[PDB]
Every structure is written in structure tokens, then in C-alpha cells.
């Protein structure tokens, strides 16, 4: 009939190559089909200076309110960026300023095409990975190193001893994890499982670290039965605590949520999702990058071929979450459909240099093998058009 | 030839299940017909290990420690499943570890690369040698408090505290972990010794940016050892050592042909070699990277055909013998060691291979019987091709 009513959504504008494909994804993949009621924020490096990172904070508050946000890729400043752009301060990361105000866990997932040679040729259903995510010093010249814990209620303090250096020279460490951060890593990663209809795996190392790692399985399992237990059976699922060496072993044709604590998977097909505990709130970024090299030669008369999929899926993840949240079937379907066409366009034999580069090595690639950033973008639209007409009648 | 070659004091350790069989086959067909040895063989098979009460395991370590060379077969590592299976009276520790425990040193893995076998990068022509550097005090934070590490040199000229963190919501866990300077210097040597033993360049990857003080010590000490001694031998042998960051090390490897030692701070399995290089640079324990290959052994017991790649096992020998010959300046053995390695690859590049290697070239569903040789066939091929090479070698 006409454009689908999506709802409240937080967009974030990036910078460099990715911004170009971002403001290209919109016009002919999203915008012609979905009426978005959107709060966009410009995280373009330049804009981030004007507002003095304030605009970043705001987008973070934005998400926390409306529960759903996408994000383009954004420069994180180091020494060059200050000289190149002339920044006024060593601006922090756009992520983090977000992360440290939202919590939850990052979930990285590769996008699998039958055309693409993967590590362990047989991984059909992809694997979702959620890495949990430091006070070191030198100990020059022999002494005694001891970690101490002194409780709040003024009861007996507890000294420990992390080896004393009898004969000199060393280096020492101290790290930790608060209970509540273990609780957030649990739900996020319990919630996630139901949200894919896939089984969960916490892989630890409690045999060695008895009281550190032990505690993760001592906070996971318990929160697995108190709630979320029946739900897995209600979805034909299970959660096992595995063990690092057995998980790097049994992984299988794939299709699970690997929740581990402690060059592979190609680049332009690595989507990320930040899942907040509540289950309600979610953020989606293709966590791959601004792709500066490509932009460098885009700003020149030269032509580029750049893989848009990751960012395309960043949208379809976030939108799928609105529909899930709001019970918006019409939207939900379209999200799935966008994803479907993306993969299918690839599997049909139309792609960019980097995906062709996986087939036939870099030296063997020729021009007749891939479409460029622009001509890949049309092909997606054309086929999306096609796909959409088909589902109507 | 004429007669065998005298190789001398070597220490042999035997394993379990499928390896053991091919391990014997190796000896029968490839080493013994050609080489005489003062063998200090210890039988580390699960049954025997239980019979001895794992004394035989510690007995091997000390022998390696004395005789410098040790070629180890695989071996079962006990868990509840095995404990029931063999009716073990205890769940003994992994031999490999116990061996490592008494010896120290640094393990280096190598994938044996041949021209008709696919790689991660089609660029890699020469092998890449990766060496892994390998308790902490860990405890639970009862409730809200302030955990903090604190150091005191034992000559009261400082007391330095840091915050790991103060818990205000409370609960949680915490742990501190030292690293002895000694362990770093050892790591250095071994992975400088090995850089010359194979005559390639050395790269140490780290995460300096994040742990400026921790990783920072790994960079500095490698440098001191590289210069207080090792720099000379390096430059002489037209090679270099050069620290790198982990980020731009991964990509730098893709754009290469391999052929370097990569020190690291944290293809088929049947092509994976593992060598434990001690800091003294005299002791070495070779072994395959895989296990006892239980699934293959199970079929062998039911009368089915197996197709098990021995290469990894074969290379433990050749590697070990190469080391013994290097220590003893035995040019005859030194040559023989390269020959068996020379034959092994040459045989595979000639289209004769096990089922695993076929799978690499074609893919599981697309492999037929006519494409590969079984365990016992592949062995013959090698022995026949081996005897061949050795005849034309006499010239
Ligand atoms: N905010 C974020 O989510 C995020 C994430 C990562 C990096 N960054 C920022 O990126 C800036 C510097 O870029 P970088 O050096 O890290 O490069 P990058 O964007 O991480 O990409 C590095 C290489 O990955 C390949 N690649 C990535 N995406 C691709 C795609 N869609 N299509 C084709 N190839 C793709 C390209 O390799 P080829 O050279 O072979 O073409 C590119 O040169 C830094 O300021 C960093 O902070 C931001
Ligand atoms: N001492 C050691 O160095 C060591 C190391 C690791 C494991 N182990 C012992 O191994 C026992 C269990 O075996 P596992 O499950 O670990 O099997 P494994 O020997 O580690 O190998 C697992 C699978 O890899 C393939 N494979 C391994 N080596 C091969 C070769 N040489 N040629 C062709 N294919 C090969 C086979 O897969 P396909 O069946 O699909 O062909 C095999 O089933 C454990 O009890 C463990 O203690 C010992």
C-alpha cells in the first residue's frame, strides 16, 4: 500500500567512508519503505568538537529513553586526528561514553553466505559471541607484593600475598569484577538466547581460577533457574556451562550464543549489538569501522568498492527490535526481508572486491568480479523491490 | 646404504590409542631400519601409567633432563569418562604438563606446509613458528569494602598502594597476578635460540598501548637480551629481531609469505608439530599437536578402515633427531633427518595422501575412496619412497 509506520528510533551519524554508505543505505533501502519517527544525532567528528562531546552524551540519553538505537561508524581521536582535524581536546570514544551510561554486553556476529569460505567449512548457522569486557605496575628490585581487601563495616581486614620476590625484578597485576556486572552479563546473554531461539554457552576457566571464574558459573546458573529456566524448554533450548578448551573443541555446524570471559571472520560482515539487561533496551552498530583508506581514495577521483552489509544489518537489527517490542508484524517482516535480500544478492554472485577477494585470493581478483560501492547499492534496492512485490501477492 | 647410522642417546615416550599404532609403524618402517639408537624408551600408555602410579611419567622427564632429546607420542589425559573406562585408581594429571612442569621451556607450534595443501593465506610459502608464553591469587569480595593492591620493597624505601577498586554496591570478586622477571628472560632466550635454529626473523607481539607497564616489561627485556648477547649472532646470519604491536602484526602476516618466528603473549591437525625449547637451548621435547585420535582408534577396533595422517608424529622424530645430530655434530643423522622430512612432503605433493588431506583439497562431501590412501597404505608409500631417496643420496 504505502510506507510502513516504524516508530521511535535513535540514529547516529558517523564520519568518513561509512557516513557515505550510511546516507546511501537510508535513501534507497530504508526510507522508501519505512516512516521513521527518528531522533537523529550527528556524531560526525566535526560536530563532536563544536558541542564538546555533549552531543554524544545526549544520544546516549536518547537511547536509554526509547530503547532502540542504530549507529554509524565514528572516528576515535588520537594524535593524528588532533593534527588533521584540529580538535580542541583528546575527545573520548563515542562508544563508552555510550557504553558506560548504558551497561550491557556487546554481541558480535558474522554474516554467513554459502559463497564465502569460512574457517571450519561447515559452520552454517552462525555463532553469536559476547565478550564480557586493569591496574598493573612494575615491581623493580625485590620486595613483597600483597593484594589487600579492607571491608566497609570496619571488620577485620584481609591481606593476601601475590608472591614476594625473593631475588628481584618483576611486574604485578590487579583486576576484578563486581557481582552486579556479572548479573548484567548474565541477563543480557540469557535474554539474547531467547531472542534468537538458540542455546547458550558460558565458557570459563574455573578449574584453574577456582574463586574468580567459579563465581561466573556461580552467578549464571543460579540466575538461570530462578528465572529463564522454563523459557528455554518453552523454546526447545538449554544452557550449558562448558569450559574454554571444550568449547574451542566442540565448535559443530554452529548456531549458539557463546558467552565467554577471559583477521578472522572477514571485516565488512561483522555486526555488533549491545544488549541491556532490562531486555527492552538495545543498540546496534556494525562494529567494523570508518574505513579511512576507502574514504581517502573516495575523496579523490578514484573509485571505491566497500562492503555495506554490516551497516545494513545494523539497521535491520534495530528495526527488528522495534517490531519485536511494539508487536509490529509488518515492520518485523521487512527487516527480515532486507537481511534476506542482502545475503541472497551475494549468494547470487554480485559483490564487492573484499568478498570476491575471499574467493580467488587478492592477486587473482579482476574487475569483472565485483561491483563497486555504488553499483552494489542499486542491486540491493532492485532486489528489495522485487522481494517486496512478491510478498504482497 | 651399507649399515645403519649411529644416532645416540634419545628418550622415547609412547602414547595411547591410534597414535601408538602409527608410532610403532613409524619405528618399524622409517627409523629403525636406517638408524641405531641408545634408546631410553618409557611406555606412557594409560594402563602402564596407572600401574606405576605415574612414576614412569616423572621417570621420563628427568631422562629428557639428562639426555637432552625426547620424542613423545600422544597420551590420554584422565577425566571421569576414562576413570571409568580403564578403571583408574586415581585421576592422574596430564603427562604433557608434568613433563612441562619439571622441564620449563617454551612450546613452539609449526604447521607443516606443502604446495598442494590449502592455507589460511595463499601467500604463505614458508612456515610460521608461533611460541606461546604460559597461579594467581583469586578470592571473593564478601561485601562492600575497598580492595587494593600494595607493594613494598623489603628495604623500607617505599610503600605504594593502588586501587583495584572500592566496592560500594558490594559483592564481587578480585585477583592479583605477578610475573617473575626470570620467566620473561627464559621466554626471550628460547625464542631467540629457536630463531637461529631455523634461521629466520623474530617478532614479539604484545599490547603495549593498554598495559604500558606490564607488556612494557616484555618489550624491554627482549631487547636487553637481544643486545647484551643475541644481536651479534642475528645480524651475522643475515636476520633480525623486531618487536611489533599485535594490531599491525596480524595484517603484516597476511601480506607475507610467512617464514618467521612469532613470539606471542596471551590446516589439518594432522599437520601440526609441537616443540618444547628450554631456555638453556640444549634440551628439546618433540610431539604431535593432536591427541590419541580416539574416533579413528574406535573404527580400528571394529575392523573398519582408518586413514590417519602420521606426518605430525613423523616430524617429532625428524625434529628430535635433527636436534640430537646438531648437539653431536652427526652429519649423517643431520642429513637423514632432512631426508625423511624431504620425502614426507614430496610424497604429498605427488598426490598421495590420507583422507584428511584430501578433504582440504576437495571438501568432505566431495571425497571418494580413489582419492586417498589408508593409514597402512600411506606408510608403505613413505617407506618405499624413503628407500628410493636414500639410494640416489649416496651420489
Ligand atoms: N566507531 C566504530 O564503530 C569504529 C570501529 C573501528 C574503527 N573505528 C575508527 O576507524 C578509524 C581508522 O580506521 P581503521 O584503521 O580502524 O580502519 P577500519 O575501518 O577498521 O578498516 C580496516 C580495513 O578493514 C577493511 N574493511 C572494513 N570494512 C570494510 C568494508 N565495509 N568493505 C571493505 N573493506 C572493509 C579495509 O581493508 P582494506 O584496506 O583491505 O580495504 C580497511 O582498510 C579510527 O579513528 C578508529 O577509531 C571506529
Ligand atoms: N598428549 C597430547 O599431546 C594430547 C593432546 C590432545 C588430546 N589428547 C588426548 O586425546 C584424547 C581424545 O581425543 P581428541 O578428541 O582430543 O582427538 P584428537 O586426537 O585431539 O583429534 C580430534 C579430531 O581431529 C582429527 N585428527 C586429529 N589428528 C589427526 C591426524 N593425525 N590425522 C587425521 N585426523 C586427525 C580427527 O577428526 P575426524 O574424526 O573428524 O577425522 C579427530 O577425531 C583425550 O583423552 C586427550 O587426552 C592428547
Coordinates of N, CA and C in Angstrom, one line a residue, chain B residues 201-316:
Chain B
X201 N 63.6 -14.6 10.9 CA 63.5 -13.4 11.8 C 62.5 -13.6 12.9
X202 N 62.6 -12.8 14.0 CA 61.8 -12.9 15.2 C 61.0 -11.7 15.4
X203 N 59.7 -11.9 15.8 CA 58.7 -10.9 16.0 C 58.0 -11.2 17.3
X204 N 58.0 -10.3 18.3 CA 57.2 -10.4 19.5 C 56.0 -9.5 19.5
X205 N 54.9 -10.1 19.6 CA 53.6 -9.3 19.6 C 53.2 -9.1 21.0
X206 N 52.5 -7.9 21.3 CA 52.2 -7.5 22.6 C 51.0 -6.5 22.5
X207 N 50.6 -6.0 23.7 CA 49.6 -4.9 23.7 C 50.1 -3.7 24.5
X208 N 51.3 -3.3 24.2 CA 51.9 -2.1 24.9 C 51.0 -1.0 25.2
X209 N 50.2 -0.6 24.2 CA 49.2 0.5 24.4 C 48.4 0.5 25.6
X210 N 47.9 -0.7 25.9 CA 47.0 -0.9 27.1 C 47.7 -1.1 28.4
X211 N 48.7 -2.0 28.4 CA 49.5 -2.3 29.6 C 50.9 -1.8 29.5
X212 N 51.0 -0.5 29.3 CA 52.3 0.3 29.2 C 53.4 -0.2 30.2
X213 N 52.9 -0.7 31.4 CA 53.9 -1.1 32.4 C 54.1 -2.6 32.4
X214 N 53.0 -3.4 32.1 CA 53.1 -4.8 32.1 C 53.8 -5.3 30.8
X215 N 53.1 -5.2 29.7 CA 53.6 -5.5 28.4 C 54.9 -4.8 28.1
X216 N 55.0 -3.6 28.7 CA 56.2 -2.7 28.6 C 57.5 -3.4 29.1
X217 N 57.3 -4.3 30.0 CA 58.4 -5.1 30.6 C 58.8 -6.2 29.6
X218 N 57.8 -6.8 28.9 CA 58.1 -7.8 27.9 C 58.9 -7.3 26.7
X219 N 58.6 -6.0 26.3 CA 59.4 -5.4 25.2 C 60.8 -5.1 25.6
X220 N 61.0 -4.5 26.7 CA 62.3 -4.0 27.2 C 63.3 -5.2 27.4
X221 N 62.8 -6.3 28.1 CA 63.7 -7.3 28.4 C 64.2 -8.2 27.2
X222 N 63.3 -8.4 26.2 CA 63.6 -9.0 25.0 C 64.8 -8.2 24.4
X223 N 64.7 -6.9 24.4 CA 65.7 -6.0 23.8 C 67.1 -6.1 24.5
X224 N 67.1 -6.2 25.8 CA 68.3 -6.2 26.6 C 69.0 -7.5 26.3
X225 N 68.3 -8.6 26.2 CA 68.8 -10.0 25.9 C 69.3 -10.1 24.5
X226 N 68.5 -9.4 23.6 CA 68.9 -9.3 22.2 C 70.2 -8.6 22.0
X227 N 70.5 -7.6 22.9 CA 71.7 -6.8 22.7 C 72.9 -7.1 23.6
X228 N 72.6 -7.5 24.9 CA 73.7 -8.0 25.8 C 74.3 -9.3 25.2
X229 N 73.7 -9.9 24.3 CA 74.2 -11.1 23.6 C 73.8 -11.4 22.2
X230 N 72.5 -11.7 22.1 CA 71.9 -12.3 20.8 C 72.0 -11.4 19.6
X231 N 72.2 -10.1 19.6 CA 72.2 -9.3 18.4 C 73.3 -9.7 17.4
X232 N 74.5 -10.0 18.0 CA 75.6 -10.4 17.2 C 75.3 -11.6 16.2
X233 N 74.9 -12.7 16.8 CA 74.6 -13.9 16.0 C 73.5 -13.6 15.0
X234 N 72.5 -12.8 15.3 CA 71.4 -12.4 14.5 C 71.9 -11.7 13.2
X235 N 72.4 -10.6 13.3 CA 73.0 -9.8 12.2 C 73.9 -10.6 11.3
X236 N 74.8 -11.4 11.9 CA 75.7 -12.3 11.2 C 75.0 -13.2 10.3
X237 N 73.9 -13.9 10.8 CA 73.1 -14.8 10.0 C 72.1 -14.1 9.1
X238 N 72.4 -12.9 8.6 CA 71.5 -12.0 7.8 C 70.0 -12.1 8.3
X239 N 69.8 -12.0 9.6 CA 68.4 -11.8 10.1 C 68.4 -10.9 11.3
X240 N 67.1 -10.6 11.7 CA 66.9 -9.5 12.7 C 65.8 -9.9 13.7
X241 N 65.9 -9.3 14.9 CA 64.7 -9.3 15.8 C 64.1 -7.9 15.7
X242 N 62.7 -7.9 15.8 CA 62.0 -6.6 15.8 C 60.6 -6.8 16.5
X243 N 60.5 -6.1 17.6 CA 59.2 -6.0 18.3 C 58.1 -5.5 17.4
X244 N 56.9 -5.9 17.6 CA 55.7 -5.3 16.9 C 54.6 -5.2 17.8
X245 N 53.6 -4.4 17.4 CA 52.3 -4.3 18.1 C 51.4 -5.5 17.6
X246 N 50.4 -5.9 18.4 CA 49.6 -7.0 18.0 C 48.6 -6.6 16.8
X247 N 48.3 -5.4 16.8 CA 47.3 -4.8 15.9 C 47.8 -4.9 14.4
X248 N 48.9 -4.3 14.2 CA 49.6 -4.3 12.9 C 50.6 -5.4 12.6
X249 N 50.5 -6.5 13.5 CA 51.2 -7.7 13.3 C 50.4 -8.7 12.5
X250 N 49.1 -8.8 12.9 CA 48.1 -9.7 12.2 C 48.1 -9.4 10.7
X251 N 47.8 -8.1 10.4 CA 47.8 -7.8 8.9 C 49.1 -7.9 8.2
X252 N 50.2 -7.5 8.8 CA 51.6 -7.7 8.3 C 51.9 -9.2 7.9
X253 N 51.3 -10.1 8.6 CA 51.4 -11.5 8.3 C 50.6 -12.0 7.1
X254 N 49.4 -11.4 6.9 CA 48.6 -11.7 5.7 C 49.3 -11.3 4.4
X255 N 50.0 -10.2 4.4 CA 50.7 -9.6 3.2 C 52.1 -10.2 3.1
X256 N 52.3 -11.4 3.6 CA 53.6 -12.1 3.6 C 53.6 -13.5 3.1
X257 N 54.8 -14.1 3.0 CA 54.9 -15.5 2.6 C 55.2 -16.4 3.9
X258 N 55.0 -15.8 5.1 CA 55.4 -16.5 6.3 C 56.9 -16.5 6.5
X259 N 57.4 -17.6 7.1 CA 58.8 -17.8 7.3 C 59.5 -17.0 8.4
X260 N 58.9 -17.0 9.5 CA 59.3 -16.2 10.7 C 58.9 -16.9 12.0
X261 N 59.7 -16.6 13.1 CA 59.3 -16.9 14.4 C 58.5 -15.8 15.0
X262 N 57.3 -16.1 15.6 CA 56.4 -15.1 16.2 C 56.2 -15.4 17.6
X263 N 56.8 -14.7 18.5 CA 56.6 -14.8 20.0 C 55.3 -14.1 20.4
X264 N 54.6 -14.8 21.3 CA 53.2 -14.4 21.5 C 52.8 -14.5 23.0
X265 N 52.4 -13.3 23.5 CA 52.0 -13.3 24.9 C 50.4 -13.2 25.1
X266 N 49.8 -14.2 25.8 CA 48.4 -14.3 25.9 C 47.8 -13.7 27.2
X267 N 44.5 -25.3 8.6 CA 45.1 -26.6 8.2 C 44.7 -27.7 9.1
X268 N 44.9 -29.0 8.6 CA 44.6 -30.2 9.4 C 45.4 -30.3 10.7
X269 N 44.8 -30.9 11.7 CA 45.5 -31.1 13.0 C 46.7 -32.0 12.7
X270 N 46.5 -32.9 11.8 CA 47.4 -34.0 11.4 C 48.6 -33.5 10.7
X271 N 48.8 -32.1 10.8 CA 50.0 -31.5 10.2 C 50.6 -30.5 11.2
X272 N 50.3 -30.7 12.5 CA 50.7 -29.8 13.5 C 51.9 -30.3 14.4
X273 N 53.0 -29.7 14.3 CA 54.1 -30.1 15.1 C 54.3 -29.1 16.3
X274 N 54.8 -29.7 17.4 CA 55.0 -29.0 18.7 C 56.3 -29.3 19.3
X275 N 57.1 -28.3 19.6 CA 58.4 -28.5 20.1 C 58.6 -27.6 21.4
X276 N 59.1 -28.2 22.5 CA 59.3 -27.5 23.7 C 60.8 -27.1 23.9
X277 N 61.1 -25.9 23.6 CA 62.5 -25.4 23.6 C 62.8 -24.8 25.0
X278 N 63.8 -25.5 25.7 CA 64.2 -25.0 27.0 C 65.1 -23.8 26.9
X279 N 65.2 -22.9 28.0 CA 66.0 -21.7 28.0 C 67.5 -22.0 27.8
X280 N 68.0 -23.1 28.3 CA 69.4 -23.5 28.1 C 69.7 -23.7 26.7
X281 N 68.7 -24.0 25.8 CA 68.9 -24.2 24.4 C 69.5 -25.5 24.0
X282 N 69.5 -26.5 24.9 CA 70.1 -27.8 24.7 C 69.1 -28.9 24.8
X283 N 68.1 -28.7 25.6 CA 67.0 -29.7 25.8 C 65.9 -29.4 24.8
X284 N 65.2 -30.4 24.3 CA 64.1 -30.3 23.4 C 63.2 -31.5 23.5
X285 N 61.9 -31.3 23.6 CA 60.9 -32.4 23.6 C 59.9 -32.2 22.4
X286 N 59.9 -33.1 21.5 CA 59.1 -33.0 20.3 C 57.8 -33.8 20.5
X287 N 56.8 -33.5 19.9 CA 55.5 -34.2 19.9 C 54.5 -33.7 18.9
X288 N 53.6 -34.5 18.5 CA 52.5 -34.0 17.6 C 51.6 -33.1 18.4
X289 N 50.9 -32.2 17.7 CA 50.0 -31.3 18.4 C 48.6 -31.9 18.7
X290 N 48.2 -32.9 17.9 CA 46.9 -33.6 18.2 C 47.0 -34.5 19.4
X291 N 45.9 -35.3 19.5 CA 45.9 -36.3 20.6 C 46.0 -37.7 20.2
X292 N 45.3 -38.6 20.8 CA 45.4 -40.0 20.5 C 44.4 -40.4 19.4
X293 N 43.7 -39.4 18.9 CA 42.7 -39.6 17.9 C 41.7 -40.8 18.2
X294 N 40.9 -40.6 19.2 CA 40.1 -41.7 19.7 C 39.1 -42.1 18.6
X295 N 38.5 -41.2 17.8 CA 37.5 -41.7 16.9 C 38.0 -42.6 15.8
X296 N 39.3 -42.4 15.4 CA 39.9 -43.3 14.5 C 40.2 -44.7 15.1
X297 N 40.7 -44.7 16.4 CA 41.0 -45.9 17.1 C 39.8 -46.8 17.3
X298 N 38.6 -46.1 17.5 CA 37.3 -46.8 17.7 C 36.9 -47.6 16.4
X299 N 37.2 -47.1 15.3 CA 36.9 -47.8 14.0 C 37.9 -48.9 13.7
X300 N 39.1 -48.6 14.1 CA 40.2 -49.6 14.0 C 39.9 -50.9 14.8
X301 N 39.2 -50.7 16.0 CA 38.8 -51.8 16.8 C 37.6 -52.6 16.3
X302 N 36.8 -52.0 15.4 CA 35.6 -52.6 14.9 C 35.9 -53.2 13.5
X303 N 37.1 -53.1 13.1 CA 37.5 -53.7 11.8 C 37.4 -52.8 10.6
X304 N 37.0 -51.5 10.8 CA 36.8 -50.6 9.8 C 38.2 -50.0 9.2
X305 N 38.2 -49.4 8.1 CA 39.4 -48.8 7.5 C 39.6 -47.5 8.2
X306 N 40.8 -47.2 8.5 CA 41.2 -45.9 9.0 C 42.1 -45.2 8.0
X307 N 42.1 -43.8 8.1 CA 43.0 -43.0 7.3 C 43.6 -41.9 8.1
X308 N 44.6 -42.2 8.9 CA 45.2 -41.3 9.9 C 46.5 -40.8 9.4
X309 N 46.6 -39.4 9.4 CA 47.8 -38.7 9.0 C 48.9 -38.9 10.1
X310 N 50.1 -39.5 9.7 CA 51.2 -39.6 10.6 C 52.2 -38.5 10.6
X311 N 52.1 -37.7 9.6 CA 53.1 -36.6 9.4 C 53.6 -35.9 10.7
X312 N 52.6 -35.4 11.4 CA 52.9 -34.8 12.7 C 53.8 -35.6 13.6
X313 N 53.4 -36.9 13.7 CA 54.2 -37.9 14.5 C 55.6 -38.0 13.9
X314 N 55.7 -38.2 12.6 CA 56.9 -38.4 11.9 C 57.9 -37.2 12.1
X315 N 57.3 -36.0 12.2 CA 58.1 -34.8 12.3 C 58.7 -34.6 13.7
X316 N 58.0 -35.2 14.7 CA 58.5 -35.2 16.1 C 59.9 -35.9 16.1

